[PDB]
Amino acid sequence: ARYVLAEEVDFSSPEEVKNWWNSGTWQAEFGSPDIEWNGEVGNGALQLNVKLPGKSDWEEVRVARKFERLSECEILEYDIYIPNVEGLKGRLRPYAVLNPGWVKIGLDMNNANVESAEIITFGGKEYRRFHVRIEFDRTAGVKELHIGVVGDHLRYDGPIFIDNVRLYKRT
């Protein structure tokens, strides 16, 4: 099948951040501010301030945005960056959800142990980089994309960044 890019969010400007909201948590917490713009990471990225205790297999924080063409789309991609602090252990289990309908997509398709990760550099600082690619079916009536950042025995108190959110549809 062939696809074109329908929507893309690169967070080049802080005014994009108002389109995103905190859609909840599960066995994890947001700090304050929960979500903010960061202009160094990714030349602009969405910064989630999180606290994951690292005691269970599913410790989730979630952000969301409306996308008018979401019901026409079939592939989602995004990047997650985590500061390359020494000693971090555990697994990320990132996924996403389409709503209305709370349609969970990509469950356990992009899981990554943090210990053996690609790195990327911004501003002379290193970040662990995790790419997420999810295929799904055209889903009628959906209008919101929720991105779920999930830790699995990943004890971490600090920022996690999202960037390069891309949605593709068929030509």
Ligand X SMILES: OC[C@H]1O[C@@H](O[C@H]2[C@H](O)[C@H](O)[C@H](O[C@H]3[C@H](O)[C@H](O)[C@H](O[C@H]4[C@H](O)[C@H](O)[C@H](O[C@H]5[C@H](O)[C@H](O)[C@H](O)O[C@@H]5CO)O[C@@H]4CO)O[C@@H]3CO)O[C@@H]2CO)[C@@H](O)[C@@H](O)[C@@H]1O
Going by the annotation, the residues of the binding site for Ca(2+) are 10, 42, 44, 163
Length of the chain: 171
Please return the burial class of 92, using the count of CB atoms within 10 Å of its CB with bins 0-12, 13-18 and 19+. Answer: buried
Q: State which of positions 105-134 bind ligand X (CB under 6 A).
A: 107-108
Contact segment (CB under 6 A) with ligand X among 65-73, 103-111, 115-123, 156-164 equals 103-111
Min dist. Cβ of residue 86 to Ca ion (A): 26
Q: Do 145 and 67 touch, CB atoms closer than 8 A?
A: yes
By a kind-dependent CB cut-off of 5 to 8 A, residue 24 interacts, out of Ca ion, ligand X, none, with: ligand X
- Residue 102 interacts, among ligand X, Ca ion, none and using kind-specific CB cut-offs from 5 to 8 Å, with ligand X
Nearer to ligand X by Cβ, of 3 and 102: the residue is: 102
Rounded to the nearest whole angstrom, what is the least distance from the CB of residue 62 to ligand X in the complex? 7
Instruction: Give the CB-nearest residue to ligand X.
Output: 26
Of the residues 13, 58, 115, 157, which one makes contact with ligand X according to CB under 6 A:
58
DSSP string, 29-97: EEEEEEEEEESSGGGSEEEEEEEE---SS-EEEEEEEE-TTGGGEEEEEEEEEEE--TT---EE--EEE
Q: Does 59 contact ligand X by CB under 6 A?
A: no
Query: Can you tell me the distance from the alpha carbon of 81 to that of 53, in angstroms, rounded to the nearest whole number?
Result: 19
Residues of this chain that bind Ca ion (CB under 5 A): 10-11, 42-44, 163
Check residue 104 for interaction with ligand X (CB under 6 A). yes
Told to check if 26 binds ligand X by CB under 6 A, we report yes
Query: For residues 169 and 171, what is the distance between their CA atoms, to the nearest angstrom?
Result: 7
Q: Which residues bind ligand X (CB under 6 A)?
A: 23-24, 26, 57-58, 60, 102, 104, 107-108
